[PDB]
Ligand binder design. Structure first.
Ligand SMILES: [K+]
Ligand SMILES: [K+]
Ligand SMILES: [K+]
Ligand SMILES: [K+]
Ligand SMILES: [K+]
Ligand SMILES: [K+]
Ligand SMILES: [K+]
Ligand SMILES: [K+]
Ligand SMILES: [Mg+2]
Ligand SMILES: [Mg+2]
Ligand SMILES: [Mg+2]
Ligand SMILES: [Mg+2]
Ligand SMILES: [Mg+2]
Ligand SMILES: [Mg+2]
Ligand SMILES: [Mg+2]
Ligand SMILES: [Mg+2]
Ligand SMILES: [Mg+2]
Ligand SMILES: [Mg+2]
Ligand SMILES: [Mg+2]
Ligand SMILES: [Mg+2]
Ligand SMILES: [Mg+2]
Lengths: 132, 101, 49, 171, 88, 316, 196, 565
RNA sequence: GGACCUGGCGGUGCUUCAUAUCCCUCUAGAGGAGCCUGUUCUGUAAUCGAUAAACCCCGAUCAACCUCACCACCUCUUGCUCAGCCUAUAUACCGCCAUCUUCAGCAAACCCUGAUGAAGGCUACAAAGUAAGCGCAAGUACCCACGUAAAGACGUUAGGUCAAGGUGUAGCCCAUGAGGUGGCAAGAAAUGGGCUACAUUUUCUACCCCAGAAAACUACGAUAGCCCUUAUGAAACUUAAGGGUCGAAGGUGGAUUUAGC
């Protein structure tokens, strides 16, 4: 049976998110896309280089904001700019958040030669869609 | 820090194919004609065959950039079917959705 | 260039700014095998000779 | 490489083998169960091997009313921090390797005679703090099923009493 | 801004491709993916260089993520001096 | 327990009514409209511009509706502080369903003492909204059996109103072909234009009111354009059925498809354009003959694991 | 002790404020800034759509909160000092082909990414009718034989497409050079043109 | 687009948890974000090879790693100029001797480019990412050693030496070095003359009359060497004259009347040094008032451009002089001159900015109508600046004067959002004002809702080093706000805290407690009131006790009450 | 050992069914010949894996070198990597799947029955069941309401894959690692799937549907063999295309069997 991106049923004590509660056949019906660029449009190029940046950015943020990411990243590209939008927990102190914003923005701007901006949206606790 | 030695060999192959690209092009041009004498074309057949084997572009293999898989690779994303689906099944590839018609 | 990606995030982990959960995993498994006796031998001075 | 690295959740899920064919029908011994450990429990954001002190993250941003600058611990001072950390972890392991001496019942491995505490309080302001629960028998009953085959089920017999003439049992 | 503009919608394109469902064997079981590209042509007329410059910058800057653009410009020129009469 | 059914009280819904009214005045300031005359259709239009979503499911897109159309109707508290249920049939479990059966059974006894198209019985799913009670299939049938029994009897005026509540309405679209508007050309000849479709073929046909039975497909005589007789037979069919051959002049232009797909597309176009020069009764006969219906049979796609659309690879 | 989050500024917002000042430029959906009870998501059985707080579906959307009608009308009023007036004389398109018989094509591509380069931006197409050129019988007959399939008899338009050089300013100069040599070579009668 | 009055500065994250509450967080949240950019550049220049790859088109030169380490590792004349552009003071001075020791000819343009780097920093290394009091001009410093070695010295040589001494408070020596310049038949530049006026006065603390004669000699030498003064030359004179507050008043104006004649548009700094000189802590401030009025009219309706570093300080100075004069018509001109063009960038750093708005919003509340004072409070705060306790207390004294005590339940919610949740002086002026007089029920029940939120603050406090302390007045007021409101039940639970902390209860709280008990008609409670007052030995209790006895007191209780005394 | 429970099975019964399905019935095929291709045997110094249904043009949307893991010979040793391993174990696993599924179940939490045994739980003119959640369903995609996709729970077969990658355990560390040069991957035989044919409803040509020829030892019929040329490539008897020569079997296929409304 199909397994991809599916959270198997449990007693009911497992909390899943909206994105985690929907399988691949809902990606364009009930879900959007976590990355939005033009590489995959008809007649566009550099789809393999925008993809490698996304795989690394999601890992850079997961290891740079450990335990603070409630949900997956939403990467946005507008021309030269790259916008990282994230939902984070409120456990960490704000002082440490501002440090990580200026460190990640600057480091990633010199690495991908592009203006990078990061927009945090803190949430008290991980939003729960339903309990599987 | 590449996936495996197989990937590392191709990296060298692709680096040596970029250095001799012009030299090989200029020598083949002589061979690929009916104008120049055979004597000169026979000397160019020995010059391009004496260059390192890794400069030949037919030895370059389009492997995956994450798992170095030689077959089942998509050229537009340079990914294997397994790595492509993983990112596509999680909605990480802009525009990629499952087809139903 | 896997070198750049693999060398940057190795340096950032030693500087404390990136937490690699995969290395921690295999840093702890390699630490629990020294206590169990399964330690990598010195080169040259191997089991065979 | 750096793109062939997974997360902690994926690494432990494969190492524990909790969900597998072996677990399903008594095909795996419990002599040496593998145990999950959190490798991020005692980690501070900004602490690395080089011993760098990052203002605003690792250490206080301002000292003596003035902003600090980037500094790096000395070898002598960084060697004391790694050894004092290892104490933290070394503790967890053996502590988590001690035993809670359950007042045994009729036998050491027997469930019978063990206390389960008082019953759960009722919703409409009902409590049974004066009652005591004691196990009498714990049997493992099996039944043949159409798809799974031999599935394991538990039958338990208990008694409750207040010590003042009121008592009952259930299954 | 006082520009004449007409809008129509060209037929969309759907690129599809198939991949093996399993890591190993099971050839008969595959998965199909698609990319949908939708178009929208805005044909403006009788502009000038300055007018097109600011307008294009304004809409180009506000172009949303996941949306490309192809601006085709048809410029009006005059016959070159040499083309006016032959060099007898 | 972590999973609890999201219960919404009257005080919570009362605070949601105030946030929508205030949000309705903010959305009108963004768009520059008058707050007072800002209906719900404009909110749906403003939320689709400010929050453009292309999700196929329309229930998964941004929505800013009134809290009475979002939150579901909930069974209200069914007892006072003392604890006595208001209704006398509370302990039945279906006090709303049984109070209705008790009322209907009480009106059928009075009748003994003193003694249609376009309408359908309320469906099960629509009857659980009037009562806010889950109902089985069998219970719904029992209720319908009493209403029908009520109708057969000589019910009074009041009873008719009672039954009418449970009778929903169905709009039936008259199966009548839409006549095309007869036009006039520069010379003054009357004609009617229509369009047809068959497989991948699309055709436009112009049917002149008076003619000598001349047909030109793409500027070519039909017999030249259609060598195969079958194709010509299809062209004749519409006119032969209405027994008016050699009376109209046709000028059509078919594009796409193949030999047999083009004729079918022209047949349907001529037939539709020939309904303007025939009586209503004749148009119904054409419809019953299958001359005004668009054949929906189109090629079926091939599946990844099979040789064909439905053919399977040989089983070893 | 544990830091406590402040109440959202939405409550402070007035109904008769200036929205453009809140969302002057493109930004992601901030539920603490948007004073709308907008929900999104597919509801569960006997459930309602997810609220904006913590909604990752409203962050994926490329919103147009920065491009409200009031703003556009306010933005373009300030951009009328950059635009120039189109000559009133040129009413229709037939009059534009009398004073400007040459039409130059050039395309710009806008894609996301760090690099703005595109090899498709070098192509230049030059269209010009032969009725606007000072040609005679011989010249016109000879010019149609040199261009081959670049001339369409149905429209009497010569189309020159140049993609040889990297830059678009070089291909425009090359297309104007080709038009001159073809015009000056069409008027020149050789001695081998008598064997026609 | 204008400013969003409901939001904090754009630099901060638009999120309630990440929004800076107080003014300390505001400055500490931007220093932690600047520490991430320094910790990233540290890593970008220490390990460039990771960031050398360039994929941008067009090339971004500002997103590439810097290379400070010198490359030319040889010993030539062109290898030294590469260590002077990288400001490597130690390497250049150590590599110069080796080059000089060899005997290779050194141009005069390359040794003058080394003195500039040594005379500027004073033979000290510049600050780096990672590796005030007194005089920093050491006597055993390279600047003086290399100066003697040089075989030939031009004008630039001395010019860049005199400026290096004054910068490191070596005033006395620069004047001795300026006599040699005169002995070599040379001519100094404007920059060299600028520092000579700073050194002259600073060198000795003599009376102004002597100094004025001295300064005039340099200016007369400046006109004898065909030297034209610039803005900074005049700016030093005004800055130097600051010490002689009174005496310099008239002379400073002369300097300003010579800047116009010779066409030198005074900048914001030139006016900032005049007002400071004129400004003094004097009650009349008669002279100061006229000066600012004339200055503002001249500056009125102008756009400014940076010329001197002191230009920023002007706005802070003007507002301070306006708050001392208590003139609001003059504060609307200064703040109206800060909005024209892009003059809003001269306001200054965060410290200067908060001081300017504080003095500003404090003169608005006091002086103007309370309806507009609440429009400036919604605009500036928090988008412009976070308020300090004294500003919320200054606002509370305006509502009291404007009989608008219904906004105090809104001023306290804001205070909690601006970091004044646990400010003793703030809570001690809010409770007294609310409890000062009786108010209608609807307004009396709102004050009780603020006293129940102000009472929680005392119960839970951030600092646990000391035992929780309740001011005498607060407890005195929180209890009387419950009675009037109607929360009698809670009014009796606060009685124990009065004696627990030995806090004396006022008579107005006891007198009003009688009505509550009388309405309840429960003598028991009434005795409790008498018991509490008796504990403090209050005189009124003895007289009050008799009245309670007459009205509603049990016979047994009456006997006990007298004995208790 | 006696008596029960559940489940499975039955060359077990009744009744009702199967719509491309069990059988008959409709249509084109398979097995027959040649070729292509895979597998198994055999062979070779010379991989691995899948392998009843659910393997067999399967991993491979692909092997001249490379790919490559194989063999033979030579070489290196902190080694592209704060090493490395295509080394063993899929019966430690994640991950991705197959299958029954062309199903309709699945289930927490309660309640009741059976004397409080495993177990069980319906009757509508109603007799103990109520049920969130998962699935089906509904929605959605494609040309609608149809149909086709997709979806398809829990489980089953310790099903498949450590050789996608990662990984637990045990093992190698001057070698079970790494690199270079050359090289094999065949065919007595058997078998699966497919292509082309055995022709006249055909063959060739013109046309694209009103034609003229052909037509059994110079007919139909090879995409095979042999020879040449060309294309790609550093490299081709070798791969592919084309031309020339050649003109075989085969004359409709045993037992059985596949797909399709
Ligand atoms: K049985
Ligand atoms: K056959
Ligand atoms: K065969
Ligand atoms: K598995
Ligand atoms: K393994
Ligand atoms: K593996
Ligand atoms: K076959
Ligand atoms: K044939
Ligand atoms: Mg060749
Ligand atoms: Mg024991
Ligand atoms: Mg399937
Ligand atoms: Mg077919
Ligand atoms: Mg094999
Ligand atoms: Mg080889
Ligand atoms: Mg090997
Ligand atoms: Mg298995
Ligand atoms: Mg359907
Ligand atoms: Mg299917
Ligand atoms: Mg479905
Ligand atoms: Mg023949
Ligand atoms: Mg042949």
């Amino acid at each position: 049976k199909n397994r991809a991106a599916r959270v198997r049923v449990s007693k009911g004590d497992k909390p899943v998110t909206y994105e985690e509660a929907h399988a691949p056949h809902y990606i364009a019906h009930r879900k959007g896309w976590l990355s939005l660029h033009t590489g995959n449009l008809d007649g566009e190029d550099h789809a393999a280089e925008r993809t490698v940046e996304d795989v690394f950015l999601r890992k850079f943020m997961w290891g740079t904001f450990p335990g603070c990411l409630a949900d997956q990243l939403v990467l946005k590209r507008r021309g030269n700019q790259l916008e990282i939008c994230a939902v984070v927990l409120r456990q960490l102190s704000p002082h440490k958040y501002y440090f990580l914003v200026g460190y990640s923005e600057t480091l990633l701007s010199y690495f991908y030669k592009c203006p990078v901006r990061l927009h945090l949206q803190t949430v008290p606790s991980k939003v729960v869609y339903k309990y599987l | 820090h590449y996936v495996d030695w197989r990937m590392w060999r191709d990296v060298k192959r692709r680096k040596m194919a970029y250095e001799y690209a012009d030299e090989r092009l200029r020598i083949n041009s002589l061979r690929k004609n009916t104008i120049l004498p055979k004597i000169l074309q026979d000397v160019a057949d020995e010059e391009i065959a004496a260059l390192p084997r890794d400069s030949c572009p037919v030895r370059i293999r389009n492997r995956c950039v994450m798992t170095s898989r030689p077959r089942g690779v998509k050229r537009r994303w340079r990914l294997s079917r397994i790595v492509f689906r993983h990112l596509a099944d999680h909605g990480q590839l802009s525009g990629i959705q499952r087809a139903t018609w | 260039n896997h070198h750049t990606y693999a060398e940057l995030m190795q340096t950032l982990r030693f500087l404390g700014l990136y937490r690699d959960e995969h290395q921690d995993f295999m840093d702890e498994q390699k630490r629990l095998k020294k206590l169990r006796g399964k330690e990598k031998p010195k080169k040259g001075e191997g089991k065979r000779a | 490489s750096f793109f062939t690295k997974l997360t902690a959740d994926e690494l432990w899920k494969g190492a524990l083998a909790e969900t597998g064919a072996g677990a399903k029908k008594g095909r795996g011994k419990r002599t040496k169960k593998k145990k999950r450990k959190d490798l991020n429990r005692g980690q501070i954001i900004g602490e690395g091997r080089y011993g760098f002190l990052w203002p605003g993250l690792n250490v206080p941003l301002m000292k003596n009313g003035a902003v600090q600058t980037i500094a790096q611990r000395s070898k002598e001072e960084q060697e004391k921090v790694e050894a004092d950390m290892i104490q933290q972890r070394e503790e967890w392991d053996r502590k988590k390797k001690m035993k809670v001496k359950r007042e045994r019942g009729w036998s050491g491995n027997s469930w019978g005679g063990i206390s389960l505490g008082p019953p759960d309080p009722g919703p409409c302001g009902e409590t049974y703090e004066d009652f005591d629960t004691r196990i009498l028998e714990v049997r493992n009953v099996f039944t043949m099923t159409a798809k799974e085959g031999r599935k394991k089920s538990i039958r338990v017999l208990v008694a409750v009493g207040n010590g003042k003439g009121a008592a009952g049992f259930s299954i | 801004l006082g520009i004449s503009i007409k809008v129509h919608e060209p037929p969309r394109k759907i690129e599809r491709f198939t991949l093996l469902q399993s890591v190993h064997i099971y050839k008969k079981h595959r998965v199909q993916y698609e990319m949908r590209t939708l178009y929208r042509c805005l044909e403006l007329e009788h502009l000038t260089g300055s007018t097109a410059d600011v307008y294009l910058e304004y809409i180009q800057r506000n172009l949303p993520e996941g949306v490309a653009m192809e601006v085709t410009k048809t410029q009006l020129e005059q016959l070159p001096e040499h083309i006016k009469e032959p060099i007898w | 327990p972590t999973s609890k059914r999201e219960t919404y009280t009257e005080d919570f819904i009362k605070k949601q009514i105030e946030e929508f009214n205030i949000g309705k005045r903010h959305l009108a300031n963004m768009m520059g409209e008058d707050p007072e005359t800002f209906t719900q259709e404009d909110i749906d239009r403003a939320i689709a511009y400010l929050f453009p979503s292309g999700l196929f499911e329309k229930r998964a897109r941004p929505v800013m509706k009134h809290p009475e159309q979002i939150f579901p109707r909930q069974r209200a508290i069914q007892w006072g502080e003392d604890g006595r249920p208001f209704h006398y049939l509370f302990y039945t479990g279906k006090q709303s369903y049984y109070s209705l059966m008790h009322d209907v059974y009480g009106m059928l006894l009075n009748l003994e003492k003193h003694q249609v198209i376009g309408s359908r019985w309320l469906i099960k799913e629509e009857l659980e909204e009037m009562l806010v009670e889950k109902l089985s299939d069998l219970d719904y049938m029992q209720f319908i059996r009493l209403l029908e029994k009520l109708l057969t009897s000589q019910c009074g005026a009041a009873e008719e109103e009672f039954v009418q509540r449970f009778r929903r309405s169905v709009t039936l679209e008259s199966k009548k072909q839409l006549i095309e508007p007869v036009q006039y050309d520069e010379q003054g000849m009357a004609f009617s234009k229509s369009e047809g479709k068959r497989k991948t073929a699309k055709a436009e046909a112009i049917v002149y009111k008076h003619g000598s039975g001349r047909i030109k497909v793409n500027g070519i005589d039909y017999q030249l354009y259609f060598p195969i007789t079958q194709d010509r037979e299809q062209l004749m069919f519409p006119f032969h059925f209405v027994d008016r051959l050699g009376k109209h002049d046709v000028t059509c232009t078919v594009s796409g498809g193949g030999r047999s797909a083009q004729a079918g597309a022209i047949r349907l176009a001529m037939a539709k354009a020939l309904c303007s020069f025939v009586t209503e009764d004749e148009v119904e006969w054409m419809r019953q003959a299958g001359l005004l219906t668009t054949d929906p049979r189109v090629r079926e796609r091939k599946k990844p694991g099979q040789e064909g659309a439905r053919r399977k690879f040989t089983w070893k | 002790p544990r830091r406590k989050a402040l109440p959202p500024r939405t409550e402070k917002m007035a109904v008769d404020q200036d929205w453009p000042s809140v969302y002057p430029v493109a930004a992601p959906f901030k539920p603490s800034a948007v004073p709308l009870p907008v929900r999104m998501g597919y509801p569960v059985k006997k459930g309602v759509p997810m609220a904006k707080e913590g909604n990752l579906e409203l962050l994926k959307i490329p919103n147009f909160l920065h491009l409200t009608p009031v703003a556009i009308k306010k933005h373009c009023e300030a951009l009328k000092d950059f635009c120039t007036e189109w000559p009133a004389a040129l009413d229709s398109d037939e009059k534009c082909e009398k004073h400007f018989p040459i039409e130059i094509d050039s395309t710009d591509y806008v894609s996301s990414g760090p690099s703005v380069r595109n090899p498709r931006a070098r192509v230049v197409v030059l269209r010009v009718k032969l009725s606007s050129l000072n040609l005679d019988d011989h010249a016109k007959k000879k010019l149609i034989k040199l261009v081959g399939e670049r001339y369409c008899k149905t429209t009497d338009v010569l189309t020159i497409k140049t993609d040889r050089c990297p830059l678009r300013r070089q291909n425009y100069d090359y297309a104007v050079y080709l038009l001159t040599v073809l015009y000056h070579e069409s008027w020149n009668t050789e001695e081998w043109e008598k064997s026609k | 687009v204008n400013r969003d009055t409901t939001a904090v500065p754009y630099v901060f994250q638009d999120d309630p948890y990440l929004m800076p509450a107080s003014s300390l967080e505001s400055r500490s949240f931007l220093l932690a974000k600047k520490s991430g950019e320094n910790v990233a550049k540290f890593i970008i220049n220490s390990y460039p090879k990771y960031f050398q790859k360039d994929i941008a088109e067009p090339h971004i030169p500002c997103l590439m790693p810097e290379y400070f380490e010198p490359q030319i590792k040889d010993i030539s004349e062109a290898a030294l100029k590469e260590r002077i552009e990288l400001r490597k003071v130690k390497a250049s001075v150590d590599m110069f001797d080796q080059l000089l020791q060899a005997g290779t000819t050194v141009s005069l343009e390359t040794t003058n480019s080394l003195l500039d780097l040594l005379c500027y920093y004073g033979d000290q290394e510049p600050s780096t990412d990672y590796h005030q009091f007194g005089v920093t001009w050491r006597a055993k410093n390279n600047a003086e050693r290399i100066f003697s070695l040089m075989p030939e010295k031009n004008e630039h040589s001395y010019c860049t030496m005199i400026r290096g001494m004054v910068k490191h408070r070596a005033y006395e020596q620069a004047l001795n070095l300026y006599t040699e310049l005169l002995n070599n038949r040379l001519h100094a530049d404007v920059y060299t003359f600028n520092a000579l006026i700073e050194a002259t006065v600073c060198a000795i603390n003599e009376k102004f009359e002597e100094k004025w004669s001295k300064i005039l000699e340099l200016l007369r030498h400046m006109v004898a060497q065909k030297v034209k003064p610039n803005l900074q030359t005049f700016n030093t004179i005004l800055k130097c004259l600051r010490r002689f507050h009174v005496f310099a008043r008239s002379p400073a104006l002369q300097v300003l009347r010579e800047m116009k004649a010779i066409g030198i548009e005074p900048s914001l700094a030139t006016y900032h040094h005049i007002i400071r000189l004129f400004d003094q802590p004097g009650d009349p401030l008669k002279r100061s008032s006229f000066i600012i009025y004339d200055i503002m009219n001249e500056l009125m309706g102008k756009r400014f451009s940076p010329k001197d570093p002191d230009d920023d300080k002007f706005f802070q100075s003007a507002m301070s002089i306006c708050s001392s004069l208590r003139d609001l018509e003059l504060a609307y001109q200064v703040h109206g001159l800060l909005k024209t063009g892009d003059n809003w960038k001269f306001i200054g750093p965060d410290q200067h900015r908060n001081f300017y708005y504080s003095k500003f919003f404090d003169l608005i509340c006091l002086m103007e109508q309370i309806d507009v004072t609440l429009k400036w409070y919604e605009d500036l705060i928090p988008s412009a600046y976070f308020p300090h306790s004294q500003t919320m207390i200054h606002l509370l004294q305006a509502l009291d004067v404007a009989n608008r005590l219904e906004v105090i339940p809104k001023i306290w919610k804001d205070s909690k959002e601006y970091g004044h949740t646990f400010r003793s002086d703030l809570r001690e002026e809010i409770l007294m004002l609310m409890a000062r007089d009786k108010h209608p029920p609807e307004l009396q029940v709102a004050f009780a809702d603020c006293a129940a939120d102000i009472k929680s603050a005392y119960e839970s406090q951030p600092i646990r080093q000391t035992a929780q302390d309740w001011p005498a007045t607060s407890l005195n007021c929180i209890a009387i706000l419950f009675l009037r409101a109607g929360r009698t039940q809670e009014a009796w639970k606060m009685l124990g805290l009065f004696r627990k902390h030995n806090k004396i209860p006022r008579s107005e709280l006891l007198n009003e407690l009688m009505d509550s008990a009388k309405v309840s008609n429960s003598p028991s409670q009434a005795i409790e009131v008498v018991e509490l007052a008796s504990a403090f030995s209050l005189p009124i209790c003895e007289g009050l006790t008799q009245r309670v006895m007459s009205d509603f007191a049990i016979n047994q209780e009456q006997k006990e009450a007298l004995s208790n005394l």
